[PDB]
Each structure stands twice: as structure tokens, then as C-alpha cells.
């Protein structure tokens, strides 16, 4: 199995009346959370931070302080075709599209990052839609030029 | 044992949207609650109680109902020099200052009744200062005449 090598204390949850509602992650010295998750981040230091909005790309992004940048996720643009490691389980990337097995992912799973074999984040999950046996999921990735390409399947239901 | 007195605990967490911000004590037939914390007391009988403010001493005080007047801490007017018990370990009262080992107590760990070997509360902690050697705490003690003398270390932060 490969779940045990996906442990990461950097990722944080956003609660809503004491239940899992969202997931905010620190990548490259920057905190990311989705538009569609409402609540307060569990970490008080990040809750003290003031975040700005980005409606089109569905991301609050905030600048972490100096001490926070010591331990954070690493991002790269290259995405070789094939399988990738996600917190729930394996995912596969083909034809410019991420996808997951059926039923993997539901409400409150948005904001989880996607990891590769060598342990660095390549994209942030926002939602998914059930194509069939495999569930294509909406996810924001990073281009080689660094423009944060947002790929989204048609009539994708929010997670 | 110093922690063998957690059975003596009758404190009530205060929850704000499912988050505990402090503890309210019942000392000497009187309910004491930190002012800086927000939320609702754990039990409904004390939640419905009306509390009178005290800004200078920074807490709310309320008269306990007659039924559970006996079910309370017993106070003490004298504080002999030396080390006492607490939930988070032995804490020493030296030259008028209640000091704990460093790195003990943080945000939300306020309103804790301090105890001695006799199992009687002598002070209530509100906040502290991280002095390099050892952490001193803003406390509310009691003296012989009972005028509620309060001590705050210089440049104190709320807990």
C-alpha cells in the first residue's frame, strides 16, 4: 500500500459546527482553500491571516509568515501520464484528465491535494462528477509557465 | 500525586461554536468565569445563570443556586512559599509569583483553578507570560481580609 507514505501534517481541515467541511493546504509557502467551503480553519494562526478572493479559479490564497515556509508542500508542473497517490487512494491521469475510481470522493473531500510517487503536490482537488466506473474530478493544476491551469469536467457537481 | 486531584475537578468548559475557549470554576459557592472567553457554559443550569461583570479583575461572578452550594471548591486565604499542584503539573508560588514550567499552558487554557496539597483552591489563572526560564501567569488569588488581590506580570497576554 501507499497510503502510509502520504502522511502530511501540513494539510488542515475547515470545520463547520464540529464536522469536516473543507480542506486548506499550504503549498510553496501559500495557503489555499476553496470558495465553496464555509467555516473556520482549525489552525488558529492561519485563521488570524486575512485571505483574498479569486472567484474564477475557486481559491482563497494567502501568504504564510516567515516561520511557516520552513515546512510546506512542493509543487511542480510536469505530470507524467499514469497513476498518482491521493489521500483517499490511487488516482489515474490520462489524456490530460485526472480521474478516480467510483464513489471515491464526496462532500467535504474538496481541497485535498494530489501527490506523486516522490512526494510532492501537483494539483488541488475541488470537486468531481461520476462519469461511470471512473469518476473524473475537477482539479486545479500548474502549467510549465506557471499560470495555474484549471481543468473542470462538464456539469461537475460541487464537492 | 499532583494530578491525582483531577477527581476534585468540578470546572465547566465554555464552548463557542463547538470550540472550548476556557473553563469556569465554582469556588466557595460562587461561579467564576473568565471575561475574555466567549461561548456557553457546559451545563444548562449555569448557562441560564445571570453573571455580573468585573472589568478591573477581568471576570464574571455569579451566585450559585442554593441546591449545589455545597458542591464547590473550598478556598484559602494563605499561600505558603513553595510548590503546589495543578492539572498540567507542579507549579511554584515564589515571592508572590505563580510560575509554571515553560511551554505549559496556551490559548484557551485559562480559568484553571490552582490547587495545593490539601485539595483547596487558592487562585484562578487567566493568562501568562513566557519568561525565558519559566512561565509566570496572571492569577487572581485571595488574601486574609479577602479583597481579591490580582497580579499581572508585565506585558501579559490573554489565554
Amino acid at each position: 500500500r501507499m497510503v502510509m507514505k502520504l502522511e502530511s501534517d501540513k494539510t488542515f481541515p475547515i470545520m463547520l459546527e464540529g464536522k469536516i467541511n473543507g480542506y486548506a493546504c499550504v503549498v510553496g509557502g501559500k495557503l489555499f482553500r476553496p470558495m465553496h467551503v464555509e467555516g473556520k480553519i482549525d489552525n488558529d494562526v492561519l485563521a488570524a491571516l486575512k485571505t483574498k478572493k479569486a472567484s474564477k479559479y475557486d481559491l482563497e490564497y494567502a501568504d504564510v509568515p516567515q516561520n511557516m515556509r520552513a515546512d510546506t508542500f512542493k509543487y511542480t508542473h510536469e505530470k507524467p501520464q499514469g497513476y498518482y497517490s491521493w489521500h483517499h487512494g490511487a488516482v489515474q491521469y490520462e489524456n490530460g484528465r485526472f480521474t478516480v475510481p467510483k464513489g471515491v470522493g464526496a462532500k467535504g473531500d474538496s481541497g485535498r491535494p494530489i501527490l506523486d510517487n516522490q512526494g510532492r503536490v501537483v494539483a488541488i482537488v475541488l470537486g468531481g462528477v461520476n462519469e461511470g466506473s471512473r469518476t473524473a474530478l475537477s482539479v486545479v493544476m500548474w502549467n510549465e509557465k506557471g499560470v495555474t491551469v484549471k481543468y473542470t469536467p462538464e456539469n461537475c457537481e460541487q464537492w
Side-chain angles (χ1 to χ4, degrees), chain A residues 114-153:
Chain A
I114 177 58
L115 277 296
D116 43 27
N117 268 318
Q118 74 169 265
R120 57 173 166 59
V121 61
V122 299
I124 314 290
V125 169
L126 277 296
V129 72
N130 171 356
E131 211 276 340
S133 87
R134 74 281 191 191
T135 300
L137 79 174
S138 71
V139 65
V140 288
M141 52 203 77
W142 285 281
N143 189 359
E144 51 255 20
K145 298 292 208 291
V147 308
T148 78
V149 176
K150 172 178 183 334
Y151 281 153
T152 315

Side-chain angles (χ1 to χ4, degrees), chain A residues 23-149:
Chain A
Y23 270 98
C25 311
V26 65
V27 296
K30 196 169 288 188
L31 173 64
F32 289 67
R33 51 174 292 174
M35 294 298 103
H36 68 263
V37 301
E38 271 66 0
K40 295 172 242 153
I41 184 77
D42 76 323
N43 201 352
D44 52 354
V45 61
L46 321 183
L49 294 174
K50 170 166 261 194
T51 61
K52 51 187 70 176
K53 294 306 178 71
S55 69
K56 185 198 266 218
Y57 286 74
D58 187 352
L59 281 183
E60 289 71 25
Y61 73 96
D63 181 61
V64 301
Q66 193 54 290
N67 63 30
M68 202 46 257
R69 314 201 191 111
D71 47 353
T72 179
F73 270 99
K74 314 166 50 58
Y75 82 108
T76 61
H77 48 271
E78 70 264 350
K79 309 162 196 63
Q81 303 263 339
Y83 64 92
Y84 284 70
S85 296
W86 182 41
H87 183 278
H88 276 267
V91 308
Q92 72 283 60
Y93 173 39
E94 293 83 3
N95 296 115
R97 190 58 58 178
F98 275 15
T99 187
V100 308
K102 182 175 73 175
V104 191
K107 185 61 214 97
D109 291 331
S110 76
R112 290 260 182 95
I114 177 58
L115 277 296
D116 43 27
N117 268 318
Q118 74 169 265
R120 57 173 166 59
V121 61
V122 299
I124 314 290
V125 169
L126 277 296
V129 72
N130 171 356
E131 211 276 340
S133 87
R134 74 281 191 191
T135 300
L137 79 174
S138 71
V139 65
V140 288
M141 52 203 77
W142 285 281
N143 189 359
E144 51 255 20
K145 298 292 208 291
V147 308
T148 78
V149 176

